[PDB]
Design a protein around this ligand. Structure first.
Ligand SMILES: Nc1ncnc2c1ncn2[C@@H]1O[C@H](COP(=O)(O)OP(=O)(O)O)[C@@H](O)[C@H]1O
Lengths: 1170, 132
DNA sequence: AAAAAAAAAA
DNA sequence: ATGAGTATATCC
DNA sequence: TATGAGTATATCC
């Protein structure tokens, strides 16, 4: 693939200047993805001087500094910029210190800093600090302090360099800084002079300064190369002490971000997010009280006019103040919450978009003790304040208020940046938010936690009526929250409710990044359908639309035809052999049982050694299988006069523990070498490429492969998936044996100067089990592992891979420390397993010369776990295709369980939405309009086409699918049948038979058989029959549909028969209580049901009398009530209570559409109507 | 000790040293707990970090170490005077320590000498009065 | 004049 | 109170 | 315009 393709990609992305699209590219490894993107970036940077790009990858072993240097050298033609003032490598603090120390030890500091004594003393101090930091690397608690000490030492070194450069440029540092100490706040002019001086400095000095400190002039750098972990975090500017985050820096505006390990980045981002969420916690009550107090100060005009005049003119401000006052009065938040513990552990409370959760079973309750003037919180049955309702309501208020404040802070920052003349010290959005929060009187920690509820994400502008970003995934939109109650003797009078909010999933971070920069994602697995080890591409496409571009549209079809390998492999007679290891207990099963028996004793003490090693582990019967599979793999390696290079990848690195013991593996390999293979094994060796060794992985791999290219040996390279499983080069220069033995598959039309024509790929790979797809940590506490577990389950739920039943079972298991089995038909698990396997198998496809026979050795579990569901095997390596043909005996069907789980999840989400909307509509006015609009949308067309649903006043106005989760009809059917499991929880089974959703319960039957009712339907634009179409209502939606249909028909027939005109209520706080009223005399409620079952009379009467009693207290009148049913099958009997205030009529018309109300009944109707 | 030159980073080094010493103390606490049959589990499960105890459990530990042989109890009392401070009749220390706090055994948060009840009605002998 | 979404109960 | 078996990266 | 002129000790954050 040519560099012109990537140049076209880059120029297309740059043409999206005000929209910032996302482009993804799938290309199999060994195709040029990384060779040509580097050349294209260098060429574009050279041609366009205002182009800025970031190159981001997860592992610093994949940063490709040398490749960038080579490409820059071969791309610049006339000016030949030194590549250090244009291309920068932003390293971590530890790596910068390591480079500084190494330069000091190798006399590479350019004799200007070397001569000074201040610089030398600072370097000696830095070396001591680095030694201490290395010593304290074990415990993560000491990691923070060691890092702080190292940062201080590095800052002192930077200050020394600053003074040395300032005196050489005649800059009055001290005057610019402060005659005293801590200062060095230089003006733009002084640092400009310093930059000019280093620009005119000799080339070696400037080159060293620019390489060691790329942040010396970060604006001049056109390409910035850094890890994902560094990209998420902050960079420390030269000349300054405080670090600036890449997230809000102006360096990202209109830039191009090339994520070379998209999708491997997501996990990294996710992990970082989790850590950050746990670092920031605050007392919820005090936080809410302080924010309310600050907002009230804003109201009374006690803040400077600059922000005060922007807060007060918006109606949302008045609404926020009203909600704050109502919440303070409702939950008694003015008073102290005291939770009395006798010593028992309190656990914590979780809130996930599906439910609340208590880690110690009994729910927490809270009431207001008036004698104590406190809010008593505990496990008592008395709950007068609805604590389990208090916790999420305050969180929702905080999230909304912080979004409002973020908008105001954006306005303030924009206005303030106009005043500034030199736009080199502009304030970021984070600075504006912190200034606003400080002006409101909040603490620094409170400002941090309030700002992290949403990080500068405020969307675009009504998308300029282009594309409607919609999504039904609740976890991406609400996140989750954690709450822990703490009692301390130094705040003995109240209990602190420490809160911990997680809102920024990696998908949201990527969208926020796309709000200000173009992103190009590159990998061979960039679009594998999985939400565990890849972004939720469904969510990304839902929220992006046209802005999610595809890279393959910018390649010539010759390249795509070149991606194929099943033809070139056959033409050269390359044969791939998959060998699965059926090994359980003892070593005779792996030794070659062909009749060259050596001894029936030596293998017995080999088994004894294995058993002794396993037994000394601080579960067993499983580590033996792992050891035996590995030993079988390199037995196969040791018994072949071929396979000069073999790679064995596991999910664990060899170390000191008995579960994978390094020197035991080494001695086992040596014993097997001298035990099997006379002349085959003498030319062999074993290398363990690991991060535990005292040298970088690059030289380990280089020497291991030089043992084959030059040493004439056969190496077995053993390592982990996480070390060299992704994007690592493992080919080597051929030797005479490989030259006379291998075959070449280079396409016709390739040069001889290509390196792929002089190297040979691996001849064999052992694929160990990929182990940590889903968490398995058992003690569930409020830490990183527990959050990762919960978030993985939430991701699975969002992608319609587990239903509410499985999530509830998993949560119940977590309450008991009895974690459940992994879901059997969750596509994402198998796709992630396959992704790791695909990345591993791509490490032997980086060359054109291949051995005629390739052997892939793996245990049976790898065969059972891999799959091809959403993976385009056509454009995958031949090795993986052969592996799939070997693993075909265990292929699963994911489409069906995914379909039923999608139906169940959509129904559950609709039911949760309606459960919320009723309780909120209790005290709202507009959401009544939304609820009305959704119900009428239901009844206007039960079956709706996809585009018709997407373009509607109810779908285009809400930004999600509130209530509008229609099912999918693959057969365009007009009916279906569902068995309800728990209608109280909205759980349904779409394979069972307990209820029918169709037009039979609609107006088609027993409803259109009334005079004028069908006319009323045709007048109200309600279809009589469900026309076969794309999407159909779910049972939760069908409930409201039949309810509204029955409401309309029954009210119409009631008006026709009894000739009375009913009136509706007009007070906001009493909604969803009674359908209509009558002359200030009666309240009327309508029902649509099946034949009358043995319903719980007492609960229904209790609820209806409760709403009646609250209406009695509010209306200051004595009221009657009517319960009316529309359809029945037996004699109707309006039964009243002994007092006579409640009427219950069962059925109005029969199944033939004619009423069953006789003159007697009728009169009684009139008597009760009065 | 490697980082005793600068004072700005002395705080961080002191914090790490305090954490390590607290880990040692927690190890000793759980050893004596399993040797005294005391429900270390209450703590050890409900306190996998904070590690708080109640008066009766520490009293049982103290009365167990009371009847323990002379040599080992002697070492424990010599190295950890705060193991039972309400039994020490004489407390020898530097004024720099007297102004500051002492970290009690069975606990992580240090308690200042100034507000502690151990000074009530005590006799404080300042060996160099003017130099203090 | 671009704040969110809040059942119980397990 | 069982299911299942980690390494990589970097600021406070 | 105007003076006085060190080494050393100890503990928590
Ligand atoms: N003209 C070329 N096009 C593509 N790759 C080339 C070319 N010349 C040499 N190579 C080598 O081919 C190898 C292919 O790997 P590379 O393309 O970097 O990774 P990927 O194929 O995963 O994108 C590289 O190691 C690169 O050095």
């Amino acid at each position: 693939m040519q560099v012109s393709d990537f140049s076209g990609m880059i120029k297309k992305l740059q043409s999206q200047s005000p929209e910032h699209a996302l482009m993804l590219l799938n290309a199999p490894t060994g195709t040029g993805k990384s060779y040509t993107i580097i050349r294209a970036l260098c060429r574009y940077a050279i041609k366009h001087e205002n182009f800025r790009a970031f190159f981001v990858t997860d592992q610093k072993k994949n940063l490709k500094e040398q490749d960038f240097e080579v490409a820059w050298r071969e791309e610049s033609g006339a000016v030949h910029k030194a590549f250090s003032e244009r291309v920068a490598v932003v390293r971590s603090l530890e790596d910068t210190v390591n480079k500084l120390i190494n330069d000091w030890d190798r006399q590479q500091i350019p004799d200007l800093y070397r001569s000074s004594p201040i610089f030398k003393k600072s370097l000696e101090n830095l070396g001591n600090a680095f030694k201490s930091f290395g010593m304290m690397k074990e415990n993560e608690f000491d990691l923070k302090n060691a890092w702080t000490m190292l940062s201080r030492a590095e800052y002192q070194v930077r200050r020394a360099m600053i003074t040395i450069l300032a005196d050489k440029a005649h800059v009055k540092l001290k005057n610019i800084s402060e005659a005293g100490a801590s200062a060095f706040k230089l003006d733009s002019i002084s640092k400009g002079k310093i930059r000019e001086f280093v620009s005119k400095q000799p080339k070696a000095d400037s080159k060293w300064l620019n390489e060691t400190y790329p942040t010396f002039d970060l604006e001049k750098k056109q390409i910035i190369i850094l890890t994902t972990a560094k990209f998420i975090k902050s960079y420390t500017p030269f000349f300054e002490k405080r670090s600036k985050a890449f997230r809000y820096s102006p360096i990202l505006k209109d830039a191009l971000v090339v994520l070379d390990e998209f999708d491997s980045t997501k996990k990294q981002i996710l992990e970082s997010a989790i850590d950050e969420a746990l670092k920031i916690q605050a007392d919820l009550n005090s936080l809410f009280v302080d924010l309310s107090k600050g907002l009230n100060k804003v109201n009374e005009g006690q803040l400077p006019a600059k922000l005060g005049k922007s807060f007060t003119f918006r109606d949302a401000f008045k609404e926020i103040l009203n909600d704050a006052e109502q919440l303070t009065a409702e939950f008694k938040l003015d008073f102290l919450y005291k939770m009395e513990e006798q010593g028992r552990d309190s656990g914590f409370v979780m809130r996930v978009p599906q439910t609340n959760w208590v880690s110690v079973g009994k729910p927490w309750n809270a009431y207001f003790d008036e004698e104590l003037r406190q809010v008593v919180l505990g496990r008592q049955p008395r709950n007068d304040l609805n604590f389990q309702r208090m916790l999420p309501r305050i969180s929702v208020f905080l999230k909304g208020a912080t979004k409002f404040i973020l908008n105001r802070a954006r306005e303030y920052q924009v206005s303030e940046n106009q005043k500034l003349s030199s736009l080199d010290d502009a304030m970021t959005i984070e600075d504006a938010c912190f200034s606003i929060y400080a002006a409101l009187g909040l603490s620094k920690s409170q400002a941090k936690i309030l700002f992290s509820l949403g990080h500068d994400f405020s969307s675009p502008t009504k998308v300029k009526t282009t594309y409607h970003a919609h999504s039904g995934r609740r976890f991406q939109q609400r996140g989750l929250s954690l709450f822990q109650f703490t009692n301390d003797p130094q705040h003995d009078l109240q209990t602190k409710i420490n809160a911990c909010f997680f809102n920024e999933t990696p998908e949201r971070y990527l969208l926020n990044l796309l709000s200000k920069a173009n992103v190009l994602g590159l990998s061979a697995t960039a679009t594998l359908p999985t939400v565990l080890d890849n972004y939720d591409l469904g969510y990304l496409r839902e929220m992006l639309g046209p802005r999610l571009l595809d890279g393959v549209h910018y390649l010539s079809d010759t390249t795509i035809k070149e991606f194929d390998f099943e033809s070139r492999y056959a033409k050269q007679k390359i044969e791939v052999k998959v060998e699965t290891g059926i090994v359980d207990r003892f070593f005779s099963e792996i030794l070659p049982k062909n009749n060259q028996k050596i001894d029936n004793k030596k293998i017995w003490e080999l088994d004894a050694e294995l058993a002794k090693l396993v037994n000394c582990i601080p579960d067993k019967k499983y580590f033996a299988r792992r050891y035996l599979n590995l030993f079988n793999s390199f037995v196969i390696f040791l018994t072949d006069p071929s396979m000069t290079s073999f790679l064995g990848l596991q999910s664990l690195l060899p170390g000191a523990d008995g579960r994978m013991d390094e020197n035991y593996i080494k001695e086992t390999f040596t014993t097997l070498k001298d035990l099997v293979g006379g002349q085959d094994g003498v030319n062999t060796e074993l290398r363990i490429v690991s991060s535990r060794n005292q040298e970088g992985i690059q030289e380990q791999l280089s020497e291991a492969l030089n043992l084959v290219s030059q040493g004439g040996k056969r190496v077995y390279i053993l390592s982990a998936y996480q070390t060299i499983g992704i994007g690592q080069n493992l080919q080597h220069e051929m030797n005479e044996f490989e030259r006379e033995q291998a075959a070449n598959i280079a396409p016709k039309g390739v040069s001889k100067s290509d390196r792929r024509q002089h190297t040979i790929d691996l001849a064999g790979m052992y694929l160990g089990e990929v182990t940590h797809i889903l968490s398995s940590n058992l003690p569930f506490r409020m830490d990183a592992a527990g959050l990762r577990s919960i978030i993985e389950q939430e991701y699975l739920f969002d992608a319609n891979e587990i239903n509410i039943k499985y999530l509830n079972k998993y949560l119940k298991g977590l309450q008991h420390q009895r974690l459940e089995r992994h879901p059997e038909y969750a596509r994402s698990l198998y796709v992630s397993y396959s992704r790791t396997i695909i990345q591993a198998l791509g490490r032997m496809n980086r060359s054109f010369n291949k051995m005629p026979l390739i052997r892939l050795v793996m245990p049976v579990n790898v065969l059972q776990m891999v799959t091809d569901s959403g993976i385009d095997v056509e454009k995958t390596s031949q090795e993986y295709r052969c592996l799939l043909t070997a693993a075909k005996d265990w292929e699963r069907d994911f489409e069906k369980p995914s379909a039923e789980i999608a139906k169940q999840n959509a129904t559950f989400n609709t039911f949760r939405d309606y459960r919320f909307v009723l309780a909120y509509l209790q005290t709202s006015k507009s959401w009544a309009q939304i609820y009305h609009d959704t119900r009428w949308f239901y009844v206007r067309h039960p079956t709706v086409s996809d585009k018709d649903l997407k373009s509607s006043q109810v779908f285009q106005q809400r930004d999600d699918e509130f209530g509008l989760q229609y099912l999918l009809n693959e057969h365009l059917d007009v009916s279906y049948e569902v068995k309800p499991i728990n209608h109280d929880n909205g759980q349904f089974d779409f394979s069972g038979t307990g209820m029918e959703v169709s037009a039979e319960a609609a107006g088609l039957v027993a409803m259109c058989r009334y005079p004028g009712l069908k006319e009323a339907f045709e007048s109200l634009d309600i279809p009589t029959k469900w026309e076969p179409n794309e999407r159909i209502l779910n049972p939760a939606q069908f409930y409201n549909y039949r309810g509204l249909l029955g409401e309309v028909s029954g009210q119409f027939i009631f008006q026709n028969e009894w000739s009375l005109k009913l009136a509706d209520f007009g007070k906001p706080e009493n909604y969803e209580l009674f359908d209509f009223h009558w002359e200030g005399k009666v309240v009327i409620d309508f029902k649509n049901w099946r034949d009358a079952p043995d319903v719980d009379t007492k609960a229904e009467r209790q609820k209806v009398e409760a709403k009646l009693a609250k209406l009695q207290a509010n209306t200051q009148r004595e009221w009657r009530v009517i319960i009316i049913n529309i359809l029945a099958s037996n004699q109707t009997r309006p039964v009243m209570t002994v007092d006579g205030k409640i009427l219950e009529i069962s059925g109005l018309i029969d199944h033939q559409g004619k009423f069953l109300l006789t003159p007697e009944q009728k009169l009684n109707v009139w008597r009760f109507l009065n």
